[PDB]
Structure 1
Amino acid sequence: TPVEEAQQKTIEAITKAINYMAKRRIGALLTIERDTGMGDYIETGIPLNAKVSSELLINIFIPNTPLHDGAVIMKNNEIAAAACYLPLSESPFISKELGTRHRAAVGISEVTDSLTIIVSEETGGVSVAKNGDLHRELTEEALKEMLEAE
């Protein structure tokens, strides 16, 4: 169906962008809004309401640029805003070598049903936060399975 084709196109755009950033160890923080509304967090960032593309996702997270610090929040198959604030988790069960992007991802996942993807600037490792837990060191196939399951 059109809706199904659109969802797969967006998943492919996300995975292509994450692949690029993982290879270059570009830190990234990408939250996909689900049933819990995140308007309050979207409003803290720079409004985009942009079509998804791998190219735009990559350009947003280039280090030392206006849009790279903070989270991209996606909603309704669009990039709603970039450089958004997310709450930092206080969970004592996050690996202590991880920094602010990972704690922000877990934090939003504790108060919403959203799915957040994180790329580590230290290792290029890819992780996903959902329901208060962080799933670390994902392969490309694992990330795709999570996005399709979501």
Structure 2
Amino acid sequence: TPVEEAQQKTIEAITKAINYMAKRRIGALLTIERDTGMGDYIETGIPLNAKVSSELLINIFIPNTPLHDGAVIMKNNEIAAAACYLPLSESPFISKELGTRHRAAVGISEVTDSLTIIVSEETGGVSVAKNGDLHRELTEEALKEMLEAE
């Protein structure tokens, strides 16, 4: 159906952008709003309300640019805003070598049902935060399964 084709197109756009950033070890933080509304965090960023594309996602996260500092938040199949604030987790159970990008992803996942994708700037490793937990060292197959499950 139209809705299904649109969801698959967005999943493909995300995975392509994530693959590009993982290869180049470009740090990234991408939160997908679900049932819990995140308007209050969207409002902290730069409004975009833009169509999703792998190209736009990549251009947002390029290091040392206006938009790369903070989270992209997606809502209703669009990029709602970039450079958004997310709350930092105080969980003592996050791997100690990880920094604020991952703690922000876990933090928003503690108070929403959202799914957040993180690319490490140190390793290019890809992880997902959901329900207060961080799922690390994901393959492409694993991230896709997570997006389809979501």
The unaligned stretches of length 5 or more in structure 2 are none
- Structure 2 residue 15 is the aligned partner of structure 1 residue 15: yes
1:6 Cα offset (Å): 0.1
TM-score by length of 1: 1.00
Q: Deviations over 1:83-132 (max 9, x none)?
A: 00000000000001000000000000000000000000000000000000
Q: How far, CA to CA, are the matches of 1:20 and 1:99 in structure 2?
A: 21
1:66 Cα offset (Å): 0.1
Q: How far, CA to CA, are the matches of 1:44 and 1:96 in structure 2?
A: 28
TM-score by length of 2: 1.00
1:43 Cα offset (Å): 0.1
Q: How far, CA to CA, are the matches of 2:95 and 2:145 in structure 1?
A: 23
Runs of 4+ residues deviating >4 angstroms: none
Q: Secondary structure at the match of 1:67?
A: helix
1:41 Cα offset (Å): 0.0
Count, aligned residues = 150
Q: Name the counterpart of 2:123.
A: 123
Q: Secondary structure at the match of 2:68?
A: coil
1:31 Cα offset (Å): 0.0
Q: Name the counterpart of 1:42.
A: 42
Sequence identity, in percent?
100
Q: How far, CA to CA, are the matches of 2:99 and 2:92 in structure 1?
A: 13
1:133 Cα offset (Å): 0.1
